[PDB]
C-alpha cells in the first residue's frame, strides 16, 4: 500500500523535474513580430492566463497608463483577432503603467501613485490581498526608458510570480523579487547592476531575466541575469521594433511567446531557447 | 496489482525516454586533447566498455592493423596510465585496421582481408556470431584518408551498435548501418554523400554521424548526417591535432568522450553537445 504510493510519488516527481529541465534553456533568437489586432491608444497592455485550462484562451486587455480602471476580456483568441466584442470589468483602483499580469485566475497590478501590489479576482470580482512592495519606487521614480509610470513590472514564468523594480539602496538598478501568488510576500530578492531608467523593457524566462536596451529604433536584448547562479552577461540578441515604439513586453510560459504592445497594436514574438549538455 | 505494475512500467518507460532525450544533442565544440599513455606503434586502437557492470573500468588496447591478434586487458585507468602490467588475450583471427569495438561483454572486429564481422567473448573466449557485412568493401578499397585497411568502422552510441562502411553501388560514399548486437543482422541502412576515402575518421554521437576531413595537420569535423531525418550538413568544428598523425577516433557515451589514437599516443577529448528547444 505504502510502497506503491511512494513509487508513484517518485514517478510524478521525476516526471515533473525532467519535463521542467527540458522545458527551457537560454534565449538565442527572436522571431519576426506577428500582429493580431489594432485597437486602443499607443500605450497599453494585453496578455493571457498561463494557468488556464485549455479551451479558454481568454485575452485580457488594458488601455492607458495614467487613469483607467476598465479591463476588457475577450472569450477567445478568434474573438480578439477579428471580433470587436468584449466584456468590460471595473477595478477597485486604477493602475499605473503596463506592469500588470494575469496568473492563477487573478490579476496582479499596481495601485495608483503607490508601491502597492493588488490581487484582484476576475471571476468573483472581489479583493483578497493588497501588499506593499518593500523599498520600491513609484510615480515615475524608476520607470523604463519610455517612462509612463512603469516603475513596477509584474511577470510570471515556469517557476512562478516575479516582480522587477528598483531600489534606492541599489542605486537605480534592476531588482528582482519572487512573490507568493497568494500572500504577495517576499520570498527571495536578487539585486543586479543594470539601471532601470535606461532599460526600456524586461522579461523573465524560467529564471533568467532579459533586459532590453531601448524602446524605439535599434531595440535589442542587451542584458541577462541568471538568478540561480546570480551572474550577469551582456548579450546582443536583436529583435525588431516594427511599429517604432514598445510599451509592454512580457514572456508567457504556456505559449512560450513574447506578448508585446507595439505603438497601439498587439504583437507576438517567438523565442528560441537552447540547452547545452 | 496489475494497475500498479502498469504504472511502474509506464514510469520506467517515461524515465528512460526523458533521460535519453536529455542525454545528448548536436555537437558544438571539442576540448583540448588529454594524453593518458605513450606506448605502441603509430597506429592502434584503445577503447573502454560502455555497457559494463560498475567497478569494471577495464580498458582495451590493440596495436597494429595487419596481422596482430593480441589484445590487452589493463584492468583500471590507473592500471593503464602508469602501470605497464596487462593480460594478453589471443584472437582466433587477426583484425584489419583500427576499427573495432568493445560492446557489453564482447568485442566486434573485422576478419583479416574479408568483409566479415566477428563477435568474440572477452570472458569465455569463444565465437558466437561471424557474419558478412552486405556489399561492404575490404582490403584497402574504401579505407579512410590515412589508409591502413580501415574499410569498416564499428561504433556504439545510446541507440546501439553501428557500422560505417562504403558500397560500390553508392559510389565510394559513406554508408551507415544499424547492427543487431546479438545476431549481427542488418536492421536499417542510411546513405550519405561523403566519400570514405577522403574522410579520415568518423564517429556517431547519437544517431548523427560526424565525419572529419583530414588526418594530419588541420583537422576539423567537416560533415554531419542525421539518420533520423536523413539530412546532411557541412559544418566547421575544428579540433586540435597535437601529435600530427591520427589513426582512430571513436565515441564513448558512458564517459561522453572521444577516444583517439594520435601517433602512438592515447588521447581523450571531452565533447560539448547542445539541444535547441
Ligand atoms: C491556481 O489556483 C488554484 C485554485 O485557487 C490553486 O489550487 C489550490 O492548491 C492548494 C495546494 O495545491 C490548495 O491548498 C488550495 O485549496 C487550492 N485552491 C482551491 C480553491 O481549492 C493552485 O495551487 C494555483 N496554482 C498554483 C501554481 O499555485
Ligand atoms: C540589494 O542591493 C544592495 C545594493 O548593493 C545591497 O546592499 C549592500 O549590501 C552589502 C552586503 O549586504 C553591504 O556591504 C553594502 O553596504 C550594501 N550597500 C548599501 C548601499 O546599502 C543589498 O545587499 C542587496 N540585497 C540583497 C538581498 O542582496
Ligand atoms: C548486455 O549483456 C547482458 C548480459 O551479458 C544482457 O542481459 C540479458 O538480458 C536479457 C533480457 O533483458 C536476458 O534474457 C538475458 O538472460 C540477460 N543475459 C544474461 C547473461 O543473463 C543485456 O541485455 C545486454 N544489453 C543489451 C542492451 O542487450
Ligand atoms: C543507396 O544508394 C544506392 C545507389 O544510389 C541505391 O541503389 C539504388 O537503389 C535504387 C532504388 O531506390 C535502384 O533503383 C537502383 O538500381 C540502385 N542502384 C544500384 C547501382 O543498384 C540504394 O538503394 C541506396 N540505399 C538506400 C537505403 O536508399
Ligand atoms: C511557431 C509558429 O509557427 N507558431 C506559433 C504557435 O504557437 C501559434 O501559432 C502562435 C500562438 O501561440 O504562436 C506562434
Ligand atoms: C573529461 O572527461 C574525463 C573522462 O573520465 C574526465 O577526466 C572528466 O570527466 C573530464 N575532465 C575534465 C573536464 O577536466
Ligand atoms: Ca515586461
Ligand atoms: Ca571511428
Amino acid at each position: 500500500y505504502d510502497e506503491l504510493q511512494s513509487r508513484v510519488s517518485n514517478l510524478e516527481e521525476r516526471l515533473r523535474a525532467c519535463m521542467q529541465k527540458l522545458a527551457c534553456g537560454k534565449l538565442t533568437g527572436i522571431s519576426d513580430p506577428v500582429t493580431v489586432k489594432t485597437s486602443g491608444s499607443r500605450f497599453g497592455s494585453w496578455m493571457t492566463d498561463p494557468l488556464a485550462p485549455e479551451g479558454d484562451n481568454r485575452v485580457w486587455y488594458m488601455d492607458g497608463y495614467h487613469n483607467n480602471r476598465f479591463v476588457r476580456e475577450y472569450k477567445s483568441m478568434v474573438d480578439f483577432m477579428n471580433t470587436d466584442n468584449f466584456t468590460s470589468h471595473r477595478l477597485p483602483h486604477p493602475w499605473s503603467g503596463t506592469g500588470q499580469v494575469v496568473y492563477n485566475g487573478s490579476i496582479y497590478f499596481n495601485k495608483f501613485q503607490s508601491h502597492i501590489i493588488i490581487r484582484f479576482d476576475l471571476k468573483t470580482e472581489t479583493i483578497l490581498k493588497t501588499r506593499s512592495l518593500d523599498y520600491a519606487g513609484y510615480n515615475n521614480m524608476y520607470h523604463y526608458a519610455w517612462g509612463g509610470h512603469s516603475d513596477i513590472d509584474l511577470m510570471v514564468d515556469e517557476n512562478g510570480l516575479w516582480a522587477v523594480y528598483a531600489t534606492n539602496q541599489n542605486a537605480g538598478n534592476i531588482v528582482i523579487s519572487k512573490l507568493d501568488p497568494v500572500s504577495l510576500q517576499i520570498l527571495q530578492t536578487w539585486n543586479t547592476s543594470y539601471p532601470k531608467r535606461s532599460a526600456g523593457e524586461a522579461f523573465i524566462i524560467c529564471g533568467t531575466l532579459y533586459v532590453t536596451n531601448g524602446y524605439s529604433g535599434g531595440t535589442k536584448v542587451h542584458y541577462a541575469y541568471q538568478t540561480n547562479a546570480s551572474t550577469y552577461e551582456y548579450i546582443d540578441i536583436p529583435f525588431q521594433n516594427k511599429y517604432s515604439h514598445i510599451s509592454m513586453l512580457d514572456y508567457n510560459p504556456k505559449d512560450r511567446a513574447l506578448y508585446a504592445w507595439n505603438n497601439g497594436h498587439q504583437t507576438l514574438y517567438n523565442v528560441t531557447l537552447f540547452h547545452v549538455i
Side-chain angles (χ1 to χ4, degrees), chain A residues 68-241:
Chain A
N68 205 312
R69 43 213 310 162
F70 277 135
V71 305
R72 307 185 189 176
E73 329 189 355
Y74 297 78
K75 244 182 178 182
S76 175
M77 164 65 98
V78 76
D79 279 300
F80 176 65
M81 204 152 217
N82 317 298
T83 312
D84 209 55
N85 209 1
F86 47 87
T87 320
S88 300
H89 292 187
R90 221 186 75 100
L91 258 44
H93 300 97
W95 60 78
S96 317
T98 67
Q100 330 96 341
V101 86
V102 180
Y103 173 78
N104 200 234
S106 321
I107 176 178
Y108 304 78
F109 63 75
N110 194 50
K111 206 181 73 172
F112 191 33
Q113 304 214 350
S114 197
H115 58 288
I116 286 192
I117 301 290
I118 304 187
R119 177 140 175 267
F120 171 73
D121 288 345
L122 302 163
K123 150 185 261 190
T124 76
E125 288 189 300
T126 193
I127 200 136
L128 319 89
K129 279 309 292 298
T130 40
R131 262 307 280 275
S132 73
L133 214 34
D134 300 355
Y135 305 139
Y138 54 94
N139 240 357
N140 255 359
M141 201 184 309
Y142 291 111
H143 49 83
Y144 279 148
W146 79 278
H149 305 269
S150 40
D151 320 319
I152 296 177
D153 188 24
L154 297 159
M155 55 207 95
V156 301
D157 68 336
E158 288 89 343
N159 306 330
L161 174 79
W162 303 65
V164 155
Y165 55 92
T167 315
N168 300 293
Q169 283 64 250
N170 199 18
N173 290 338
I174 288 183
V175 164
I176 319 164
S177 286
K178 176 132 181 62
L179 323 173
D180 197 20
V182 167
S183 49
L184 298 166
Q185 210 186 39
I186 284 302
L187 291 202
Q188 201 172 358
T189 59
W190 299 262
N191 291 358
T192 88
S193 284
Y194 197 87
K196 214 191 181 282
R197 287 188 246 124
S198 65
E201 252 291 337
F203 51 94
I204 281 183
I205 297 181
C206 94
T208 63
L209 165 84
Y210 301 105
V211 186
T212 325
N213 174 27
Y215 60 86
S216 57
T219 43
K220 72 176 174 177
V221 178
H222 190 216
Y223 182 82
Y225 191 84
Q226 282 88 10
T227 86
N228 193 2
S230 289
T231 55
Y232 65 98
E233 172 192 1
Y234 281 85
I235 40 191
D236 262 1
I237 314 172
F239 53 101
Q240 177 184 359
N241 204 3

Side-chain angles (χ1 to χ4, degrees), chain A residues 3-10 12-15 17-21:
Chain A
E3 185 78 14
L4 62 103
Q5 180 197 2
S6 305
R7 270 295 182 119
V8 75
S9 170
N10 206 358
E12 290 146 3
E13 286 190 4
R14 291 310 166 180
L15 264 283
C18 195
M19 291 275 288
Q20 190 261 352
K21 210 174 313 174

